Amino acid sequence: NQIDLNVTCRYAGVFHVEKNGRYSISRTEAADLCQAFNSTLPTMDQMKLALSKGFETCRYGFIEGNVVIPRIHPNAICAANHTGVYILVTSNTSHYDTYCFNASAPPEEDCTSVTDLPNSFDGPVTITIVNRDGTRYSKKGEYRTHQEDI
Ligand SMILES: COCC(COC)N1CCc2cccc(N)c2C1
Numbered sequence: 819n820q821i822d823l824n825v826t827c828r829y830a831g832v833f834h835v836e837k838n839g840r841y842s843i844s845r846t847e848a849a850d851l852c853q854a855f856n857s858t859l860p861t862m863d864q865m866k867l868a869l870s871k872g873f874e875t876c877r878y879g880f881i882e883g884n885v886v887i888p889r890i891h892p893n894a895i896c897a898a899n900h901t902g903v904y905i906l907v908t909s910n911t912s913h914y915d916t917y918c919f920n921a922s923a924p925p926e927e928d929c930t931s932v933t934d935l936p937n938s939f940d941g942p943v944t945i946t947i948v949n950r951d952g953t954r955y956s957k958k959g960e961y962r963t964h965q966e967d968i
């Protein structure tokens with residue numbers, strides 16, 4: 819009973835989280851996941867500011883209201899070569915990665931590791947935070963509050 823949460827650097831408090839390295843987070847799970855990081859789903863304005871500080875990914879993820887990919891450099895296989903905050907328009911499916919926003923983070927690029935999931939609740943799951951540099955922090959707990967997400 820294990821979950822890996824791969825996390826990025828924060829940019830103006832905004833970061834990306836993927837669960838088990840595949841698109842697998844529902845919209846309800848995304849909100850609960852950010853809550854476990856003492857964070858919220860970013861607004862579009864928060865995401866735009868993060869992009870301006872150097873944030874980009876090649877992954878669809880929830881923000882408040884939309885599913886997006888922040889892009890700085892045009893890449894043909896990431897957001898169909900778009901730059902800016904690319905908004906997903908048409909999809910059949912409901913599960914993506916998520917973005918999260920931590921107001922207490924530094925204002926610009928913070929590429930230090932994440933070493934806590936401060937607002938997880940008690941539970942039976944071994945939850946591992948995996949940083950891009952491989953640094954890992956584990957704890958037993960839970961973050962999902964909706965039965966359909968488990
Ligand atoms: C009825 O559901 C109780 C849930 C959710 O708490 C609101 N938790 C409660 C805390 C907890 C601790 C260790 C193992 C498990 N399974 C659980 C289950």
Ligand SMILES: COCC(COC)N1CCc2cccc(N)c2C1
Binds near residue numbers: 826
């Ligand atoms: C936005 O990045 C999504 C992808 C990048 O694929 C190379 N995953 C790749 C696997 C991984 C492992 C640990 C932390 C992070 N951030 C990541 C990021």
